[PDB]
Amino acid sequence: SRIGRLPIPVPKGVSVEVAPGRVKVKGPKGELEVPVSPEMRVVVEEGVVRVERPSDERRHKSLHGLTRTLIANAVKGVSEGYSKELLIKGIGYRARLVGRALELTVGFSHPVVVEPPEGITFEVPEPTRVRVSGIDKQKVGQVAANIRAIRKPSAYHEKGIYYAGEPVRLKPGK
Amino acid sequence: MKVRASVKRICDKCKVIRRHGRVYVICENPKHKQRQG
Amino acid sequence: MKGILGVKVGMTRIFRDDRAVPVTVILAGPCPVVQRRTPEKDGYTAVQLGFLPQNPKRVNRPLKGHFAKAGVEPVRILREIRDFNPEGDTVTVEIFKPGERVDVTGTSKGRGFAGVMKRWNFAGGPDSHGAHKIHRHPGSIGNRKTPGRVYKGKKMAGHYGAERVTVMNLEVVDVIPEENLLLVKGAVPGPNGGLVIVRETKKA
Amino acid sequence: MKTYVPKQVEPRWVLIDAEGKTLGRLATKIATLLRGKHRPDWTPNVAMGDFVVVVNADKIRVTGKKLEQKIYTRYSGYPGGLKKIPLEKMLATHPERVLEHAVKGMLPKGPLGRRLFKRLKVYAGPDHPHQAQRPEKLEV
Amino acid sequence: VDKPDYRPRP
RNA sequence: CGCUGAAAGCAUCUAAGCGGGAAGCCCGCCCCAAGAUGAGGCCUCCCACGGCAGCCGGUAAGGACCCGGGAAGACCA
RNA sequence: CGAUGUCGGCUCGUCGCAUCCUGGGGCUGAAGAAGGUCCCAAGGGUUGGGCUGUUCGCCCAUUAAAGCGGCACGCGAGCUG
Ligand SMILES: [Mg+2]
Ligand SMILES: [Mg+2]
Ligand SMILES: [Mg+2]
Ligand SMILES: [Mg+2]
Ligand SMILES: [Mg+2]
Ligand SMILES: [Mg+2]
Ligand SMILES: [Mg+2]
Ligand SMILES: [Mg+2]
Ligand SMILES: [Mg+2]
Ligand SMILES: [Mg+2]
Ligand SMILES: [Mg+2]
Ligand SMILES: [Mg+2]
Ligand SMILES: [Mg+2]
Ligand SMILES: [Mg+2]
Ligand SMILES: [Mg+2]
Ligand SMILES: [Mg+2]
Ligand SMILES: [Mg+2]
Ligand SMILES: [Mg+2]
Ligand SMILES: [Mg+2]
Ligand SMILES: [Mg+2]
Ligand SMILES: [Mg+2]
Ligand SMILES: [Mg+2]
Ligand SMILES: [Mg+2]
Ligand SMILES: [Mg+2]
Ligand SMILES: [Mg+2]
Ligand SMILES: [Mg+2]
Ligand SMILES: [Mg+2]
Ligand SMILES: [Mg+2]
Ligand SMILES: [Mg+2]
Ligand SMILES: [Mg+2]
Ligand SMILES: [Mg+2]
Ligand SMILES: [Mg+2]
Ligand SMILES: [Mg+2]
Ligand SMILES: [Mg+2]
Ligand SMILES: [Mg+2]
Ligand SMILES: [Mg+2]
Ligand SMILES: [Mg+2]
Ligand SMILES: [Mg+2]
Ligand SMILES: [Mg+2]
Ligand SMILES: [Mg+2]
Ligand SMILES: [Mg+2]
Ligand SMILES: [Mg+2]
Ligand SMILES: [Mg+2]
Ligand SMILES: [Mg+2]
Ligand SMILES: [Mg+2]
Ligand SMILES: [Mg+2]
Ligand SMILES: [Mg+2]
Ligand SMILES: [Mg+2]
Ligand SMILES: [Mg+2]
Ligand SMILES: [Mg+2]
Ligand SMILES: [Mg+2]
Ligand SMILES: [Mg+2]
Ligand SMILES: [Mg+2]
Ligand SMILES: [Mg+2]
Ligand SMILES: [Mg+2]
Ligand SMILES: [Mg+2]
Ligand SMILES: [Mg+2]
Ligand SMILES: [Mg+2]
Ligand SMILES: [Mg+2]
Ligand SMILES: [Mg+2]
Ligand SMILES: [Mg+2]
Ligand SMILES: [Mg+2]
Ligand SMILES: [Mg+2]
Ligand SMILES: [Mg+2]
Ligand SMILES: [Mg+2]
Ligand SMILES: [Mg+2]
Ligand SMILES: [Mg+2]
Ligand SMILES: [Mg+2]
Ligand SMILES: [Mg+2]
Ligand SMILES: [Mg+2]
Ligand SMILES: [Zn+2]
């Protein structure tokens, strides 16, 4: 039953330097700063980072898990990276890359152009599939949400922007 | 969203959540979504 | 944020593409810059402009000094335009091209002590049906014991006009540099002969 | 024998670094200094407290959710004329007012209390213009 | 709401 | 409505953190505004005059009075 | 009770929000358009007329809408009567 105590396997060759209230996580794909509570101790071991909590007080237990996972995700980010795929669905609906930017054709009277923020890379393998990639797990997931929101999945039709692996639940109309 | 003084689980998939000082009920069934008020 | 001082000369209409355009004609040029206000010196940025030449006989000594320090012949009016900083040592109508939109500030015509119907378009009282000596009166001014007073700002009779008014987003219809004329479409506060300020518009 | 009354005294200037101090509990001490009640010759009907210079007022602290929830209030006399400005914003726009407003309420009302508040000189940021007064740094 | 004069006219 | 996320191995918009989001709120526009006695600032002008933080006298820059007037105005301004 | 003028109208507002409209939103037995229902929202807006002393109400013609209340059933040293 526990996330804070479970150790963070750290592959070759990503580095983890601790500082009071932050840890820096470097890797093949860049750096990431994990702001982290003064109250938790982050502990650097052989090929392992661990986090330890001062007591079994509720707040401490809560900060504990969050902190491990925050670091664990940092670690994975700079090594493997992070990504989400979006499938576009429906007859008119298409994507294409205009330079580094993502242009969306989804049934509005105009196309929708999304700019990549620093750290995010847009990719369009087929035209009804978009891939958002980066080393920051939250940023990736966020930009994905942004893109998806441009045209939510309809309630009545397989139509709109869907996350990969997101189930189609429709309801009848008449 | 249903807004009421009595918030309860309606189906077995209903989940009671406390969020920003308020009681909600979240559920996969949208009808069951409630906030106390 | 260009601007200029000038006098309202009068209105007419011109014809432009088979259309009558009602215009006010403003004598604007030429305005010698006589001080620049700067962030280091003054704390903000703007240009004191002068306008219309004055008889030196009528310029007292403190004024003369101020003019002297600019190498500027004395002038009847000094007024600043904010956040404007012309490269020249002189501002003229040329800073406006026809088509541009401007804001014009004037001193409005003075109505003096105005009743409530002229000041605030109150409805006044009936003219018959029994109205007793109240045809142009304001009616009630309050409630009863609560609150027992009259609001600050309650519209009432009093002086009206001879006030600063700025009409906005007027089209520049034409500019005649050789005569320092700016032709603006519509109406501009105040009497003919009155001083006005023409600024680049703040609307988009 | 009648109680002693001080003849006019030369007023002491004092400097307080507000950074990180808790708004209300710094305020009461400022108030005391202003009244003059640290002085064994305290006299209630004359201004004989210290002039108080406070710096880093913008870095005052506040417990609980007050930044979001403490509302400062101004009535204009006009209909609808109650302005509500929250701590956050006040700090963000005129921070020295936050200390100022707190101390002011902890002074007596009346001519003298009004005068004492004039003896308080509060600054956001670490510096102040009262060097000519060589204000004595005070830990409170 | 019509209710009766409690005072007479002056 | 979210992202990321523990407590609570799952889940959770939240407990740490971040995002979107109203004709509404703050700014922005227009007008008043330093009696803002917390009486602000800038430019220019006068000057350190006689007799005994005070009184009396003559001036300086300047101002008022008076007059001719004014799309300013009840008088005043 | 050695007087706190009393319904309706006019005039002039100002506030509340349990919102009539306009803005934002959740659910819908929401395909769409249009609705219902609840939530946030008081910035602004909220028509002209026939009847009747009427407030109210009914009715005609429109409207985004034709909101409901407080202010001594707001307002007679303000008018009406
Ligand atoms: Mg290591
Ligand atoms: Mg240890
Ligand atoms: Mg249907
Ligand atoms: Mg029930
Ligand atoms: Mg059940
Ligand atoms: Mg759920
Ligand atoms: Mg003018
Ligand atoms: Mg007049
Ligand atoms: Mg009138
Ligand atoms: Mg008018
Ligand atoms: Mg009229
Ligand atoms: Mg009328
Ligand atoms: Mg009439
Ligand atoms: Mg009538
Ligand atoms: Mg009569
Ligand atoms: Mg008459
Ligand atoms: Mg009455
Ligand atoms: Mg009262
Ligand atoms: Mg006037
Ligand atoms: Mg032309
Ligand atoms: Mg005229
Ligand atoms: Mg002490
Ligand atoms: Mg300030
Ligand atoms: Mg008392
Ligand atoms: Mg979800
Ligand atoms: Mg999640
Ligand atoms: Mg569980
Ligand atoms: Mg939080
Ligand atoms: Mg938010
Ligand atoms: Mg979003
Ligand atoms: Mg925002
Ligand atoms: Mg609008
Ligand atoms: Mg001004
Ligand atoms: Mg002043
Ligand atoms: Mg001023
Ligand atoms: Mg004050
Ligand atoms: Mg001054
Ligand atoms: Mg005269
Ligand atoms: Mg006259
Ligand atoms: Mg009685
Ligand atoms: Mg009596
Ligand atoms: Mg009596
Ligand atoms: Mg009475
Ligand atoms: Mg009666
Ligand atoms: Mg009302
Ligand atoms: Mg409400
Ligand atoms: Mg709506
Ligand atoms: Mg619909
Ligand atoms: Mg349908
Ligand atoms: Mg709805
Ligand atoms: Mg609801
Ligand atoms: Mg409203
Ligand atoms: Mg209002
Ligand atoms: Mg209303
Ligand atoms: Mg008839
Ligand atoms: Mg009728
Ligand atoms: Mg009727
Ligand atoms: Mg009836
Ligand atoms: Mg409608
Ligand atoms: Mg009607
Ligand atoms: Mg009643
Ligand atoms: Mg009444
Ligand atoms: Mg009423
Ligand atoms: Mg009445
Ligand atoms: Mg009467
Ligand atoms: Mg009446
Ligand atoms: Mg009365
Ligand atoms: Mg009376
Ligand atoms: Mg009375
Ligand atoms: Mg009247
Ligand atoms: Zn359920």
mmCIF file of C-alpha atoms in Angstrom, chain A residues 69-157:
data_model
loop_
_atom_site.group_PDB
_atom_site.id
_atom_site.type_symbol
_atom_site.label_atom_id
_atom_site.label_comp_id
_atom_site.label_asym_id
_atom_site.label_seq_id
_atom_site.Cartn_x
_atom_site.Cartn_y
_atom_site.Cartn_z
ATOM 1 C CA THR A 69 5.814 10.651 -7.819
ATOM 2 C CA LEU A 70 6.821 14.171 -8.694
ATOM 3 C CA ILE A 71 10.497 13.086 -8.726
ATOM 4 C CA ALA A 72 9.842 9.746 -10.327
ATOM 5 C CA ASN A 73 8.082 11.567 -13.225
ATOM 6 C CA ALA A 74 10.991 13.994 -13.506
ATOM 7 C CA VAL A 75 13.369 11.097 -13.817
ATOM 8 C CA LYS A 76 11.363 9.370 -16.524
ATOM 9 C CA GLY A 77 10.869 12.625 -18.326
ATOM 10 C CA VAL A 78 14.490 13.430 -18.965
ATOM 11 C CA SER A 79 15.285 9.826 -19.811
ATOM 12 C CA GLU A 80 12.390 8.287 -21.869
ATOM 13 C CA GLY A 81 10.430 11.474 -22.346
ATOM 14 C CA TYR A 82 6.634 11.820 -22.072
ATOM 15 C CA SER A 83 3.860 11.839 -24.670
ATOM 16 C CA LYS A 84 0.115 11.758 -25.484
ATOM 17 C CA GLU A 85 -1.544 10.891 -28.779
ATOM 18 C CA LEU A 86 -4.789 12.487 -29.939
ATOM 19 C CA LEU A 87 -6.937 10.950 -32.677
ATOM 20 C CA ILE A 88 -9.156 13.291 -34.691
ATOM 21 C CA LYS A 89 -12.442 11.792 -35.885
ATOM 22 C CA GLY A 90 -15.228 12.799 -38.304
ATOM 23 C CA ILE A 91 -15.498 13.583 -41.977
ATOM 24 C CA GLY A 92 -14.131 17.037 -42.380
ATOM 25 C CA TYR A 93 -11.655 16.662 -39.566
ATOM 26 C CA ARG A 94 -7.943 16.709 -40.237
ATOM 27 C CA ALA A 95 -4.619 17.959 -38.800
ATOM 28 C CA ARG A 96 -1.415 19.181 -40.391
ATOM 29 C CA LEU A 97 1.770 20.843 -39.284
ATOM 30 C CA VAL A 98 2.509 24.376 -40.352
ATOM 31 C CA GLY A 99 6.130 24.750 -39.481
ATOM 32 C CA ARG A 100 6.554 23.842 -35.819
ATOM 33 C CA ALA A 101 2.848 24.725 -35.240
ATOM 34 C CA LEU A 102 -0.272 22.519 -35.291
ATOM 35 C CA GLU A 103 -3.181 23.484 -37.491
ATOM 36 C CA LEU A 104 -6.561 21.917 -36.839
ATOM 37 C CA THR A 105 -9.443 21.560 -39.223
ATOM 38 C CA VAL A 106 -12.434 20.589 -37.181
ATOM 39 C CA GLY A 107 -15.601 22.016 -38.636
ATOM 40 C CA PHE A 108 -15.421 25.605 -37.486
ATOM 41 C CA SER A 109 -15.580 28.312 -40.098
ATOM 42 C CA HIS A 110 -11.825 28.643 -39.771
ATOM 43 C CA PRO A 111 -8.947 26.355 -38.969
ATOM 44 C CA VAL A 112 -7.491 26.473 -35.473
ATOM 45 C CA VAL A 113 -3.743 26.995 -35.155
ATOM 46 C CA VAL A 114 -1.989 25.882 -31.999
ATOM 47 C CA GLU A 115 1.514 27.107 -31.184
ATOM 48 C CA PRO A 116 3.911 24.778 -29.334
ATOM 49 C CA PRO A 117 5.095 26.271 -26.053
ATOM 50 C CA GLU A 118 8.735 25.784 -25.092
ATOM 51 C CA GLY A 119 9.258 22.117 -24.381
ATOM 52 C CA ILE A 120 6.497 20.773 -26.492
ATOM 53 C CA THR A 121 6.791 19.203 -29.890
ATOM 54 C CA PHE A 122 3.806 18.525 -32.166
ATOM 55 C CA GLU A 123 3.796 15.590 -34.580
ATOM 56 C CA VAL A 124 1.292 14.540 -37.209
ATOM 57 C CA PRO A 125 2.102 10.974 -38.521
ATOM 58 C CA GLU A 126 -1.248 10.369 -40.242
ATOM 59 C CA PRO A 127 -3.538 13.295 -40.617
ATOM 60 C CA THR A 128 -6.100 12.101 -38.067
ATOM 61 C CA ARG A 129 -3.550 11.449 -35.339
ATOM 62 C CA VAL A 130 -1.567 14.020 -33.375
ATOM 63 C CA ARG A 131 1.282 13.358 -30.914
ATOM 64 C CA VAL A 132 2.270 15.872 -28.169
ATOM 65 C CA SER A 133 5.742 15.223 -26.722
ATOM 66 C CA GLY A 134 7.992 16.665 -24.051
ATOM 67 C CA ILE A 135 10.048 16.013 -20.960
ATOM 68 C CA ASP A 136 7.570 17.659 -18.599
ATOM 69 C CA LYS A 137 4.723 15.307 -17.799
ATOM 70 C CA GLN A 138 2.302 17.986 -16.671
ATOM 71 C CA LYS A 139 3.071 20.242 -19.593
ATOM 72 C CA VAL A 140 2.497 17.503 -22.081
ATOM 73 C CA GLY A 141 -0.762 16.460 -20.508
ATOM 74 C CA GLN A 142 -1.871 20.070 -20.373
ATOM 75 C CA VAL A 143 -1.137 20.910 -23.937
ATOM 76 C CA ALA A 144 -2.939 17.748 -24.897
ATOM 77 C CA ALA A 145 -6.001 18.913 -22.925
ATOM 78 C CA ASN A 146 -5.795 22.266 -24.598
ATOM 79 C CA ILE A 147 -5.722 20.737 -28.049
ATOM 80 C CA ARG A 148 -8.512 18.331 -27.229
ATOM 81 C CA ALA A 149 -10.687 21.172 -25.902
ATOM 82 C CA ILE A 150 -10.726 22.890 -29.257
ATOM 83 C CA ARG A 151 -13.298 20.300 -30.232
ATOM 84 C CA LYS A 152 -14.515 17.985 -27.526
ATOM 85 C CA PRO A 153 -15.824 14.551 -28.450
ATOM 86 C CA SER A 154 -19.443 14.946 -29.449
ATOM 87 C CA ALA A 155 -22.055 13.177 -27.268
ATOM 88 C CA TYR A 156 -23.916 11.865 -30.230
ATOM 89 C CA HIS A 157 -21.304 11.054 -32.830
#
